Amino acid sequence: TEEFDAIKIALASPDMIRSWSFGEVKKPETINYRTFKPERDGLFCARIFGPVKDYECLCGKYKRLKHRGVICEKCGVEVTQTKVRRERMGHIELASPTAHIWFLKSLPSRIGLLLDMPLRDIERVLYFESYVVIEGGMTNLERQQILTEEQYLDALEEFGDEFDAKMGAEAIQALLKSMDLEQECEQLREELNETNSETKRKKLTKRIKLLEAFVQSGNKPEWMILTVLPVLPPDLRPLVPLDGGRFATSDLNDLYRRVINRNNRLKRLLDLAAPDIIVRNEKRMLQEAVDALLDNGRRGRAITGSNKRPLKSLADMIKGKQGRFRQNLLGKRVDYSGRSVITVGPYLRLHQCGLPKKMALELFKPFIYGKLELRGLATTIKAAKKMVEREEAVVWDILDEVIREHPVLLNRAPTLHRLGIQAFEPVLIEGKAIQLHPLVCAAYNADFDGDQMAVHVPLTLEAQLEARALMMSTNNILSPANGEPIIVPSQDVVLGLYYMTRDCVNAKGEGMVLTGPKEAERLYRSGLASLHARVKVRITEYEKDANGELVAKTSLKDTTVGRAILWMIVPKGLPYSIVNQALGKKAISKMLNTCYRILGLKPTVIFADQIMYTGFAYAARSGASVGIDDMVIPEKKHEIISEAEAEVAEIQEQFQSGLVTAGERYNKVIDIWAAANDRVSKAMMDNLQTETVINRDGQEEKQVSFNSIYMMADSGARGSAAQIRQLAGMRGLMAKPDGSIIETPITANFREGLNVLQYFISTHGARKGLADTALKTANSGYLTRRLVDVAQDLVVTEDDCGTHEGIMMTPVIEGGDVKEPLRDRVLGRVTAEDVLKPGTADILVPRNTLLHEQWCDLLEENSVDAVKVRSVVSCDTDFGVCAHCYGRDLARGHIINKGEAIGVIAAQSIGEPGTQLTMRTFHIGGAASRAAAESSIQVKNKGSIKLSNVKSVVNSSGKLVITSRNTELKLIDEFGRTKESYKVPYGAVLAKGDGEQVAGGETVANWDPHTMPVITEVSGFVRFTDMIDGQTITRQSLVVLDSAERRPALKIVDAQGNDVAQYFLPGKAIVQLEDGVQISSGDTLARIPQDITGGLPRVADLFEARRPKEPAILAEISGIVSFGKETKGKRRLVITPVDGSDPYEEMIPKWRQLNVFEGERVERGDVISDGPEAPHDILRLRGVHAVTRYIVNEVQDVYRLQGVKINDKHIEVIVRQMLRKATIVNAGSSDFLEGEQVEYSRVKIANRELEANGKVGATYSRDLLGITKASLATESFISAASFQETTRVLTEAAVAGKRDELRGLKENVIVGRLIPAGTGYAYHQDRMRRRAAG
Amino acid sequence: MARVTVQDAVEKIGNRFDLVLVAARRARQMQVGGKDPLVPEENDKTTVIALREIEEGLINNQILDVRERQEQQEQ
Amino acid sequence: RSPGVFFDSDKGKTHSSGKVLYNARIIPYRGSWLDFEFDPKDNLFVRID
Amino acid sequence: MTYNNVFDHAYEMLKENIRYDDIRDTDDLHDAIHMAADNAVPHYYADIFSVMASEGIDLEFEDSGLMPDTKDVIRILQARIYEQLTIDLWEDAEDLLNEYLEEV
Amino acid sequence: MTYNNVFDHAYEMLKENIRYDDIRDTDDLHDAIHMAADNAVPHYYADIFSVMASEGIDLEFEDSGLMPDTKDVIRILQARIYEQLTIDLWEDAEDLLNEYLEEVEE
């Protein structure tokens, strides 16, 4: 059959239903309960929907069904279209066509109702007491008015003959036929052009767009009123929610026979010519039966369901019973995939794992049946079923032929990212448990304690190709979210290579003049240990001095035995400086990283496998044990503890003095015991030296020890200092959720004997740390749920992006030292046509290139400041993305290909951090204060500095302070790269004069949060004001006045004998001087002091795009802006004078801060810094650039607090998905001041400027509403609102006449098709090419 | 010969996504019948044979189109 | 919870400023429970069931 | 009982307040409209939650300063209902001042 | 009106989870309830303000530990439906365990 690509839901024509099914139906004797035989014609029985049993008919004659297109006696002869069950439905004939209730009540009166008439009167005239007169004229009333019985009696008395008014929907049909749609649309466009009411605007735009949906839908709205209705199949019904019955005794049959019974009674009473009240009662009960059959007919809260009303609504069985979430949500028959306990397998190279015997004998049972049929060993199927039960040797031979080169999927139940399911190759393992590759544990995020993993068998050949082509563990070496390699050795291979490449002093064997090098043979025979001293062996090495070739060299180097054996592992000549050190997690991870960067993908997998093999084989020969001699006790420890408690006794004397309060004593106890913990940590680190030594004495270090705990602490794989200090020395403080701690912590360790109170208090740390695991799991799942629900309609569809404009890449960090360099951000993304040296007329790339490590080395050896990067949003692509800007796709090495699913990797990259942030970085104490001495703003790196947004304030001293709000510092490192983002406070006291530059030392700022830059530039005494009471009640030499409760700005005094600048209002102002005091310039006049990033709800606040607590009002193009600028009587800060008119005057409710003092002309895009910034105003005025930088840098400032690293490509993809709903200003062809799709707007602009028009429709503004309507902005009904009511969406997409047009990924999950991503997009393009080719 | 990574087959035709459908439509004729493999089997399944036939650079879209027109003309 | 006289400070929950609210909820063995309430304007109220 | 019923109820109460108080000034509409915001909201929580299930009201906020500081749920959604009703009743009160000056 | 459909769907999914995971105790049988609390709850604010408007669920809480502490109302209204569903499905789970031992003739 054909496929489903883009089909509208238009109204079913009566002619299409009469051509769908043809025949006559009378006397509904449908199902006889005592016969169970094929009866006559009826409605919804065995006579309709063809036969009830597969290939036969019981009609009396012609059971072969030669002809087609007749209903002879009791069976359906005509099929003519499809198979037996998927054929036509049937029809019912109504004497009075009733309207559909979903247009009459669209929750509430949304679509299918508006005709310049209220909902309540239309609901009243469809009842029995009122009606609407049609085809009137020559009177005072109109056709839109409502009438009662006496009013219609007076109307027929006055109007006389030719009066027409029907109780049913036929008068609505005649009124809808009489009203012209085009003339009504013209009148509503004229009313939109003439009227000015704001509530009228949205109503008229909804009316115009609905009538345009009716016009360009090409269909009659009178098809909304149901005249002939098809029925549904009886086996389409599921079972009842109560106990198990039959299909004929279901809940729908009573409502169906009620509707058919009222229809036949209407036919009989119209053939009998009943009076008016009887036929109106018949039409009323028929309309009530139709309205009860379609929906439940609820009006309000619906306080109680009427004793489980049987099938009240059709929408309830479409949405709830059958399930809108039908595919891939309940789980749906996993079908030869099962669970077992995961064990480790120390063999079977990376693209291989283990599988149990009695499980793999069962997993390939149809494959065993098929191969026994193919080889001719089993004649029948029962013979094969017996040969499986006998379990003889040839069955195991066939099973070995099955498992030999066949893939499989291993799939844990928490898959927070894509590497939770990985494809491998099964090998038979004796037992019932699964052996896994040892190094896949960080990608699985679980340890070997009995965790389970489903074993999905690829059943089709294409699934085998999907497993061996995309989902293997050898295909994915890097992580798909960071770029860090995911395969990392964990404490086995790490300890083996740490013991392998460990040096010693004066061991056996010295001066090894060797060739080959072959240092393992004398280790194996006699006289040589693997930890020997520096011997000179000959080590050959390959290099890449020739492009595409290998340059071999030969040199003798001083090394150890284990490094010489480790060089035999290394293929094709890696650089020697990475294996000439001690190997921990960092060193082995950097070795694997450089091996992946240099050798590619094929040597690094066998390199990692052979590193794992030699690490296992030499950690087995190591034999590290943890004994009582390994744990060491510091010899001064008790003394330190004594000193500690002595200091506590001194504080206790202060506790008897009366000079130290409770919190100060608590902080002193925390500081003293933390200093004692630091002293015992340094004493333990000194005592780890010289424990297990070789026979050598008199040296300085004296043979650094080989106990296991110092090897694990120095290796840094799992042994960290925070647990070695808890093993030996002092444990210190604990963690309590109440926020307090004891005043005499644990003095002993786990080497010595603890007290009962010490263990009783140390239990609280486990009580605090245990509750973190179960919490915030469902919230982290729901965040990823919404991020997929907002970003499922993006796939790669083209090849070239075709732009010159992109997001400018600037190196920015947090406060303090450097956090992320520029080279991590330049690597990846494809740059634009122009990158610049500081020398003129010098370029690097002609147009573009694939940025790998050689271009990073070229940019590292040269000087670069800013990199122009081709990127998102800008150069939008119709029906998807070209994604040429998406360069260097992670976990693979190649150029980007078409059909890659983008967006579902984004939510897995955002959702990959854990359940709760850990930013305490210490114990429960620490004495975290606001500021110890000062804020300490200075420069660290060399280079000249540049100050941004500063002034020239006249001062008496040599330094020049500033009074600005925003101040930035630019630093010269290579060619203008700053690499130092120091948060300068608003109006910081600068110790350096403005206009001078210096590099190295000379700290330019010294700010204290107690002052305020409100000074005088001209020397002179204070301006005399009036001192009145009432303004001295302000909060955080006396204060005189206050501008908040009413310091206002006055004229500055310019003379020492005469009583004669601009003073802004920060919100709090306290006068620190007296009127009439001789003061000089640059002195204290009046000083008093007065965004939020980080958190797991902060991520939700970022990706929901909610409005902050304090919104910001930006500045447009140039106009005269100054304090007051003709403010009104109330609601201050209204800017009326603007040069260049621009009639845009905003009204501020006086809550906001004073905006500007300097900058009498401004530009579109100036910052105002009114607390948090409003992203929608920056999107409307500045553009996509600052909003993208704002969201991406706030996401990175959230991520850097914990150390997790996620590339900005996924976040910018989510930002691209959140930039729909483009609202226009200039009216276009088919739109007027509304919001539509961005791609449709680009298509309309291209069709305007292409052939005929000059410019019709332009200057559109984007929206950043966030998560609510952007997830509902999918313009296909199959994933418009899947959670919400189904028929509510279906009615809107039926009247609107919208097309699906195949963009989306969850769309073909809800419907069920080949998804247009990966290899499915290849099948889509092959079908679209074979359709055009023939 | 156990194939580790199909990337050397991607060097011939680089999409990573056409390779699955091309190998599938090549291997259906060898799985059903009426065709002979150009590469002898190394005691494996037809999947590894399809990966190695794409890796050697013998079968692409043009050869499949020519052989499809030849089988339609011969039938 | 054994029958007797209980006390709680409520940590400024229903007002959210940081002022404490002391209560004396009497507990019977069976029947209705009686609790006392402090107001932000420094008054008393009674909660029953 | 949907959002349109509460909308028509607030419209009728605002018409009654303009007819009673006889206000022809735009700044003097502060005492009426908030009372029109006060008497149009329901007290039963199910009657509150039934309005939110219909179209005409949204969850987004125009101003965050109107939201109080509480730990519950019904107070925030109730203040959202007050905010949406006042945003409707400003543009309704303009047209009702026009109809009151053009009616009598 | 709509809470009954969510209750019946949760009962059906929890019956299928205990039928599939075939465990036969009352101490370890909670992960099937975690399947019912994470799947049967509605996603967005439309059904959440629609189900709670119907009868069967109240605002008050049975256990103090399951109440979330956040300023977003939608998380608290989802955890409300989850906690009420677990409390209303514990006894129904034990009833279908009592019916479960002799249900299918095997």
From Swiss-Prot, chain A:
- Which Gene Ontology molecular function entries are recorded, alphabetically? DNA binding; DNA-directed RNA polymerase activity; magnesium ion binding; zinc ion binding
Q: Which keywords does this chain's UniProt record carry?
A: Acetylation, Antibiotic resistance, DNA-directed RNA polymerase, Magnesium, Metal-binding, Nucleotidyltransferase, Transcription, Transferase, Zinc
Kindly indicate whether the keyword RNA-binding belongs to this entry. no
Signal peptide range: none
Enzyme class, broadest EC rank: transferase
**Presence of the UniProt keyword Nucleotidyltransferase in the record:** yes
Q: Which cofactor does it need?
A: Mg(2+); Zn(2+)
Q: Which GO terms describe its cellular component?
A: cytoplasm; cytosol; cytosolic DNA-directed RNA polymerase complex; membrane; transcription elongation factor complex
UniProt catalytic activity: RNA(n) + a ribonucleoside 5'-triphosphate = RNA(n+1) + diphosphate
Spell out the post-translational modification annotation for this entry. Acetylated on several lysine residues in the presence of glucose.
Residues noted as binding Zn(2+) 2 in the record, renumbered to the chain: 801, 875, 882, 885
Cite the record's note on assembly.
Answer: The RNAP catalytic core consists of 2 alpha, 1 beta, 1 beta' and 1 omega subunit. When a sigma factor is associated with the core the holoenzyme is formed, which can initiate transcription. The rRNA transcription and antitermination complex (rrnTAC) consists of RNAP, NusA, NusB, NusE (rpsJ), NusG, SubB, ribosomal protein S4, DNA and precursor rRNA; S4 is more flexible than other subunits.
Purpose = DNA-dependent RNA polymerase (RNAP) catalyzes the transcription of DNA into RNA using the four ribonucleoside triphosphates as substrates.
This protein is called DNA-directed RNA polymerase subunit beta'
From what organism does this protein derive?
Escherichia coli (strain K12)
Q: Which gene encodes it?
A: rpoC
Swiss-Prot record, chain B:
User: What's its top-level EC category?
Assistant: transferase
Question: GO MF annotations for this entry?
Answer: bacterial-type RNA polymerase core enzyme binding; DNA binding; DNA-directed RNA polymerase activity
For this protein, what is the EC number? Answer: 2.7.7.6
Which GO terms of type biological process are on file? bacterial-type flagellum assembly; bacterial-type flagellum-dependent cell motility; cell motility; cellular response to cell envelope stress; DNA-templated transcription initiation; intracellular iron ion homeostasis; nitrate assimilation; protein-containing complex assembly
Q: Which domain of life is it from?
A: Bacteria
Per the record, its GO cellular-component terms are: cytosol; cytosolic DNA-directed RNA polymerase complex; RNA polymerase complex; transcription elongation factor complex
What is stated as this protein's family in its record? Answer: Belongs to the RNA polymerase subunit omega family.
Any idea what job this protein has?
A: Promotes RNA polymerase (RNAP) assembly. Latches the N- and C-terminal regions of the beta' subunit thereby facilitating its interaction with the beta and alpha subunits. Part of the processive rRNA transcription and antitermination complex (rrnTAC). The complex forms an RNA-chaperone ring around the RNA exit tunnel of RNAP. It supports rapid transcription and antitermination of rRNA operons, cotranscriptional rRNA folding, and annealing of distal rRNA regions to allow correct ribosome biogenesis.
Q: What is this protein called?
A: DNA-directed RNA polymerase subunit omega
Portion of the full sequence shown? 1 to 75 of 91
From Swiss-Prot, chain C:
Q: What does this protein do?
A: DNA-dependent RNA polymerase (RNAP) catalyzes the transcription of DNA into RNA using the four ribonucleoside triphosphates as substrates.
PTM notes: Acetylated on several lysine residues in the presence of glucose.
Protein name per UniProt: DNA-directed RNA polymerase subunit beta
Give the gene name.
Answer: rpoB
Q: Which section of the whole protein is represented?
A: 151 to 199 of 1342
Q: How is it used?
A: Co-administration of salinamide and rifampicin or salinamide and myxopyronin suppresses the emergence of resistance to both antibiotics.
| UniProt record similarity statement | Belongs to the RNA polymerase beta chain family.
Q: Subunit comment for this entry?
A: The RNAP catalytic core consists of 2 alpha, 1 beta, 1 beta' and 1 omega subunit. When a sigma factor is associated with the core the holoenzyme is formed, which can initiate transcription. The rRNA transcription and antitermination complex (rrnTAC) consists of RNAP, NusA, NusB, NusE (rpsJ), NusG, SubB, ribosomal protein S4, DNA and precursor rRNA; S4 is more flexible than other subunits. In pull-down experiments interacts with CedA.
Curated annotation (Swiss-Prot), chain E:
One GO biological-process annotation of the entry reads: symbiont-mediated evasion of host restriction-modification system
Keywords in UniProt for this one?
Early protein, Host-virus interaction, Inhibition of host innate immune response by virus, Restriction-modification system evasion by virus, Viral immunoevasion
Under the heading Pfam families, the entry gives: ocr
**Disulfide linkage:** none
Its quaternary organisation is: Homodimer. Interacts with HsdM (AC P08957), the M subunit of host type I methyltransferase restriction enzyme M.EcoKI; 1 Ocr dimer binds to M.EcoKI. Interacts with HsdR (AC P08956), the R subunit of host type I bifunctional endonuclease and methyltransferase restriction enzyme R.EcoKI; 2 Ocr dimers binds to R.EcoKI. Interacts with host PglX/BrxX (AC P0DUF9); this interaction inhibits the enzymatic activity of PglX/BrxX through high-affinity binding. Forms a 2:2 tetrameric complex with phage T7 OCR.
The protein's name:
Protein Ocr
Please report the organism this UniProt entry assigns to the protein. Escherichia phage T7
Lineage of this protein's species?
A: Viruses, Duplodnaviria, Heunggongvirae, Uroviricota, Caudoviricetes
